[PDB]
Design a protein around this nucleic acid. Structure first.
Lengths: 133, 438, 256, 162
RNA sequence: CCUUCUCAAACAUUCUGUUUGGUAGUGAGUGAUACUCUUUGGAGUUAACUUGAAAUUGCCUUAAA
């Protein structure tokens, strides 16, 4: 027997849990709505998972919408086998750069410039191709 | 040497021969043309594609022009030219004379249009160019409207003709043909004596035997194209900055025509050869290419015979031609050649790799294959969105397509191509301007 | 700075590293790398730069690529109302002098309509290399051209100020496409600690062009941006030293 | 009464939405009105009377013409009404396009098709080559009629209705 | 059933010239080379590739009734 959840792919831009829950509630109040968003550069992965109340609500909403078309996108939506356990994909965002540096004085960092460049000329010396500086 | 003046034939005949650019006739021709003039049967054997067109040809307009006023209705001479390719070519040598007047010339061909064919036979073609089997169709059907008055019979390129599988066609035609005043001739360039015991029919006295006489210093290049629409950037073959010497095989005159203007618009050196050129531009082009270093030309099995531009970097075997005799053993072209350098590639729609095995049944170890992109998007749209000859009419670059499928069509067991799969069917994935070609 | 002979032995002995026997187009490209403490901070900025160079590797890009597989060619983007003003056959009378000709002059209107459909898009822009645009639109280009073709300094548009003052007329397009052509090599200034200007193709003019390029560019950008260390390579290469500057290094301690 | 499988394939049509989309498309393509041709040809009339032609576009709607586009084959999508006075006329299209692999689509009403074409009726209106603007909307559209209509409705081929 | 930042000043009067500014993406994935970093926290940056806007679980009411 299948699951109560509905897999949804093909999710256009401007279609999120506002719109997900907003629309799909018409099939009954849904337990869960998740949209798979991007770890950075905030936007989605264009698919998400849902679950409503009972298997029947999933029947209704799915089959009603399974091939439904919108904007440029026809939305392939279908249930899953027993369970399938929506787990992960928390709401993400675009996590801004945190800049810590540079705690050390030019001692070890300008050193590591030195030793790193010296051993660099070592590296090109292994190539081997002979340079200077 | 044989020239136009001696024979004292009609002013228009040889006067028009003066328009082929020939100032005189070769030794194979000198060994033949006046020697033939008689009731004397002739059995030609000579260099491959040595120019024997004129040689055994001029009998036709001679005998007939002496009988010119006569039947004009019962078709005068029949040539049997087996290969769809060479058939259409040597018909290109039926076009030879504008000053051909009294004569008409049947193109009688496998895969041509029957209703068109006999629909033109009712008009009493004077001299015809056929292929044996469906010619049996028209002497079983139309013979009354054609047949009985025949004058001269010549088997040209007896090569596969006399071999097994055309024999029914033959022994039936000659058994039916009006041998009474018929002039029997069996021609080729080079073929065995087994022709003889296979020639036991249609030989009466008078004849005499005229003979005027893969290489491992070369490896045969190899390519596998899955997409049957397969196209190539010869620029990366031409990356030497305009300088290459490249020769390119493909099927038919229509096709070389198409590729000629097309690849003219991808802006490459463009020089081509086919039956539809006169002898004038065959000279100008091929000898221009012996005066050329940078460039390419496209030659079908017309120029697969003996013609020399040396040290060609590349022999493109594209859309494999007729004859594995020539295909395999003409490779003393590059090496052991004029001792120039290069190799020879053939672009293979996939399933036919057994042809390869046939070639490796002919036991040459082969090597190359690299990664051409049939998914280059440009060349995909760089052809079949743009329209030209099919942009003149709805009947043209088609004719390119047609020609390809007909020459490809004549081959059944000759090549490995299965009646069932790609021959002709799944190759229709190359069909049109419209793609995917279902 | 810097010594001439250093980068000259690097470029010639570099020709040694490329002397050993697409993939070719991968290998032979010579790239100039440059670093710093940090590049311009906490802003993704797509602004490009018009470099002043010894000459342009455009013309060698053209002629040597006239036989190439990719066969690059030219674009430019007009505004809405200038299109009908400047025809295609107008601007052809002129550009020829330098041997340089555009193909297609389109409106972003047509990018937003016919050239959307991201495969029709990216397939329409990816067959190019050198790009043009106009500033007034370039501000609007981020959303239209989309996140793909800003991944190549190739495809990302150069900008230009085409409009004259006021009510633009074509003369400045005629001479100013030459201005954006001959002396100038656009280059991009991303985030992070690292920027490698894409420089040239080795099979083009003798190192006499390229080394001078290295000079003018190198000391050019050294000035304003206070770079840390400078390298050169050929697309593949373990980096080649030229000017190792720890002087301005200590500026790290200046602010911190 | 029980109705033959070749009928009752009408009565299965495109939904509110998909139809709505199809007309979102074609309503771009209205074949120009009569006063239109009179327009352009009057203006150009005066022009070339005193003082460069991209290929025009529309939907190709002639029934004879339409079946003519098919069997070549040309067309891309075909719209077929559910009501023809001699219901005979169209019975063979849904089979035909079938065997020819053409995207046929049943859209309800002959007034509804007839109105996009500047006529009172069509019962068949179809297009083959389209401008590049909507080419994607086409590929997806036909993908939508495949997916909606075509997919699960193989059943209609058997099963006398009624 | 949505429609896209299509320009600025400054400088010098030249049918244009000079100069500084102004632009955060559909996503998915290929990836061999580096830079840089900071205490494992791997962060920002480095050639150039495939793609039907493809998929699976990286903690205001008159655009009504």
């Amino acid at each position: 027997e299948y699951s109560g959840i509905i897999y949804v792919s093909r999710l256009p831009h401007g279609f999120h849990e506002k719109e997900l829950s907003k629309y799909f509630a018409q099939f009954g109040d849904l337990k869960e709505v998740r949209l798979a968003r991007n770890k950075k550069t905030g936007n989605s992965r264009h698919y998400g998972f849902l679950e409503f109340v009972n298997k029947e609500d999933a029947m209704i909403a799915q089959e009603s919408m399974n091939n439904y078309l919108l904007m440029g996108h026809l939305l392939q939506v279908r249930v899953l086998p027993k369970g399938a356990k929506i787990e992960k994909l928390y709401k993400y965002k675009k996590r801004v750069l945190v800049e810590k540096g540079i705690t050390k004085p030019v001692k070890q960092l300008k050193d590591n410039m030195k030793q790193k460049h010296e051993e660099r000329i070592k590296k090109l010396a292994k190539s081997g191709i002979e340079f200077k500086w | 040497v044989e020239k136009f003046e001696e024979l004292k034939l009609s002013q228009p005949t040889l006067k028009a021969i003066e328009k082929m650019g020939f100032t005189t006739m070769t030794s194979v021709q000198a060994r033949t043309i006046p020697p033939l003039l008689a009731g004397r049967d002739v059995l030609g054997a000579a260099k491959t594609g040595s120019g024997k067109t004129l040689a055994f040809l001029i009998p036709a307009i001679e005998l007939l022009h002496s009988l010119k006023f006569k039947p004009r209705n019962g078709t005068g001479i029949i040539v049997i030219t087996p290969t769809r390719e060479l058939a259409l070519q040597i018909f290109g040598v039926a076009r030879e004379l504008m000053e051909f007047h009294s004569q008409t010339f049947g193109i009688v061909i496998g895969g041509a249009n029957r209703r068109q064919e006999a629909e033109k036979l009712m008009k009493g073609v004077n001299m015809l160019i056929a292929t044996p089997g469906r010619l049996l169709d028209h002497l079983q059907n139309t013979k009354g409207f054609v047949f009985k008055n025949l004058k001269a019979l010549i088997i040209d390129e007896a090569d596969r003709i006399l071999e097994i599988g055309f024999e029914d066609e033959m022994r039936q035609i000659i058994k039916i043909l009006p041998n009474e005043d018929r002039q029997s001739m069996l021609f080729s360039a080079t073929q065995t004596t087994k022709v003889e015991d296979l020639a036991r029919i249609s030989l009466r006295p008078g004849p005499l035997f005229i003979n005027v006489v893969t290489a491992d210093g070369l490896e045969q290049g190899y390519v596998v194209c899955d997409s049957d629409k397969r196209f190539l950037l010869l620029f990366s073959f031409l990356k030497r900055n305009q300088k290459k010497k490249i020769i390119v095989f493909l099927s038919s005159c229509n096709s070389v025509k198409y590729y000629a203007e097309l690849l003219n618009y991808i802006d490459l050196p463009v020089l081509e050869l086919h039956g539809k050129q006169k002898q004038q531009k065959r000279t100008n082009t091929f000898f221009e290419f012996c005066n050329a270093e940078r460039g390419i030309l496209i030659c079908t099995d017309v120029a697969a015979r003996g013609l020399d531009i040396p040290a060609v970097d590349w022999i493109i075997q594209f859309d494999p031609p007729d004859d594995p005799r020539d295909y395999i053993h003409r490779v003393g072209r590059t090496a052991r050649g004029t001792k120039g350098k290069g190799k020879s590639l053939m672009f293979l729609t996939p399933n036919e790799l057994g042809f390869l095995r046939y070639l490796k049944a002919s036991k040459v170890p082969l090597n190359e294959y690299e990664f051409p992109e049939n998914k280059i998007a440009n060349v995909q749209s760089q052809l079949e969105k743009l329209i030209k000859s099919n942009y003149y009419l709805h009947q043209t670059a088609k004719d390119g397509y047609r020609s390809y499928l007909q020459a490809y069509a004549s081959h059944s067991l000759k090549t490995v191509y299965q009646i069932d799969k790609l021959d002709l069917a799944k190759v229709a994935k190359s069909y049109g301007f419209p793609v995917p070609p279902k | 700075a810097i010594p001439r002979e250093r980068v000259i032995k690097a470029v010639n002995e570099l020709i040694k590293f490329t002397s050993k026997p697409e993939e070719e187009l991968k290998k032979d490209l010579q790239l100039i790398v440059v670093n710093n403490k940090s590049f311009t901070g906490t802003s993704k900025s797509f602004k490009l730069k018009l470099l002043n160079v010894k000459h342009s590797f455009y013309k060698p890009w053209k002629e040597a690529s006239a036989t190439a597989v990719k066969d690059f060619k030219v674009l430019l983007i007009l505004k809405d109302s200038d299109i009908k003003k400047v025809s295609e056959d107008d601007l052809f009378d002129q550009l020829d002098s330098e041997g340089i000709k555009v193909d297609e002059i389109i409106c972003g209107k047509d990018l937003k309509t016919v050239y959307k459909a991201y495969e029709a898009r990216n397939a329409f822009i990816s067959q190019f290399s050198l790009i043009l645009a106009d500033d007034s639109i370039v501000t609007s280009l981020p959303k239209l051209m989309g996140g793909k073709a800003y991944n190549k300094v190739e495809t990302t548009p150069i900008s230009i100020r085409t409009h004259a003052n006021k009510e633009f007329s074509l003369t400045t397009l005629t001479n100013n496409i030459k201005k954006v052509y001959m002396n100038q090599l656009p280059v991009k200034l991303p985030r992070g600690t690292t920027l490698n200007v894409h420089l040239g193709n080795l099979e083009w003019l003798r190192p006499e062009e390229f080394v001078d390029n290295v000079e003018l560019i190198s000391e050019q950008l050294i000035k304003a941006y206070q770079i840390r260390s400078i390298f050169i390579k050929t697309n593949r290469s373990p980096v080649l030293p030229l000017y190792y500057n720890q002087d301005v290094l200590d500026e790290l301690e200046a602010k911190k | 009464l029980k109705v033959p499988p070749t009928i009752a394939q009408f009565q299965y049509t495109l939904d509110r939405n998909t139809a709505a989309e199809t007309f979102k498309l074609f309503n771009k393509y209205r074949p120009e009105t009569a006063a239109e041709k009179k327009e352009r040809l009057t203006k150009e009339a005066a022009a070339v009377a005193e003082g460069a032609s991209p290929k025009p576009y529309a939907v190709k709607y002639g029934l004879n013409h339409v079946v003519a586009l098919i069997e070549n084959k040309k067309a891309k999508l075909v719209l077929i009404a559910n009501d023809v006075d001699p219901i005979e006329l169209v019975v063979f299209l849904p089979a035909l396009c079938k065997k020819m692999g053409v995207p046929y689509a049943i859209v309800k009403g002959k007034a509804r098709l007839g109105t996009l074409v500047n006529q009172k009726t069509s019962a068949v209106a179809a297009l083959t080559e389209v401008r590049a603007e909507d080419e994607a909307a086409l590929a997806k559209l036909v993908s939508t009629i495949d997916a909606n209509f075509a997919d699960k409705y193989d059943e209609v081929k058997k099963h006398w209705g009624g």
